[PDB]
């Protein structure tokens, strides 16, 4: 996972993140950029256009919960597997989400942090977060491994 310096830089940065807004944007972007992911959100309502997706109340409410779980992961970087154990079982056994999709969301989250933070999201900090989201995606995919 991460070195002590990588952990501290990642933690300090995460404190600036408006978790609710970033979650809605990331989940929204996932459904727009990778539109098959919308199938899992059939019951969320209107998903016919990019604007409808981004402004969908349920997409935004749900992105919040996603990013809250990510924030929890940020407090447990040493044991992401144990931290996401319940969510790994849910997404596999009950939701049948292909693990490739976990990597796509992780990457969309990275792109969202870049858009929201501009040059503050440095190459080094992006690299640190590439490890985090790779670690989270693998923790979620454990029920396949």
């Amino acid at each position: 996972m991460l070195t002590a310096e990588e952990k501290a830089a990642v933690t300090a940065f995460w404190g600036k993140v408006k978790v609710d807004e970033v979650g809605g944007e990331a989940l929204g972007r996932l459904l727009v950029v990778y539109p098959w992911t919308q199938r899992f959100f059939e019951s969320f309502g209107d998903l016919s256009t990019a604007d409808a997706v981004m402004n969908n109340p349920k997409v935004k409410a749900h992105g919040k919960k996603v990013l809250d779980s990510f924030s929890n992961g940020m407090k447990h970087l040493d044991d992401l597997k144990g931290t996401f154990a319940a969510l790994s079982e849910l997404h596999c056994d009950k939701l049948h989400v292909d693990p490739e999709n976990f990597k796509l969301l992780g990457n969309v989250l990275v792109v969202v942090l870049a858009r929201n933070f501009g040059k503050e999201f440095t190459p080094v900090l992006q690299a640190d977060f590439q490890k985090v989201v790779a670690g989270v995606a693998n923790a979620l995919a454990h029920r396949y491994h």
Binding site: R29, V33, P35, V111, R115, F121, P123, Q130
Partner: protein, 141 residues
């Protein structure tokens, strides 16, 4: 495959990039090399130090080829034929690396264009880069 909407989003977004294409090209490569260090094995002859003149000169070339691709969206195989020979025949680049560079480029553009990098533009650019990647990884001679 790109819709008419996609094509317009790609041209419009790349137009916004404009003269910064070279810089963003190099920053994309730098971000790829830093985040995904196995990509560095494709460039063992390069000096990959931060601020490397080779990396930056090389980013200008990648950006120029993207510009060419943006101007030839209806015949990407035709316009990018020589670069296919290079990446698919000669270098034999694993397609995973194209996803890594594509993502690094999306990260780069997002950071520099917070207002213009809308969800729809993001989608269109992702498809465009996937299309370029497919062409560059294909042996079609």
């Amino acid at each position: 495959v790109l819709s008419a909407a996609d094509k317009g989003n790609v041209k419009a977004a790349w137009g916004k990039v404009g003269g910064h294409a070279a810089e963003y090209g190099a920053e994309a490569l730098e971000r790829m090399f830093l985040s995904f260090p196995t990509t560095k094995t494709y460039f063992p002859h390069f000096d990959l130090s931060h601020g490397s003149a080779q990396v930056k000169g090389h980013g200008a070339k990648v950006a120029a080829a993207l510009t060419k691709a943006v101007e030839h969206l209806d015949d990407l195989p035709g316009a990018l034929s020589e670069l296919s020979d290079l990446h698919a025949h000669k270098l034999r680049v694993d397609p995973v690396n194209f996803k890594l560079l594509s993502h690094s480029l999306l990260v780069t553009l997002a950071s520099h264009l917070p207002s213009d990098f809308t969800p729809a533009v993001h989608a269109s650019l992702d498809k465009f880069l996937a299309n370029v990647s497919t062409v560059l990884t294909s042996k079609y001679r």
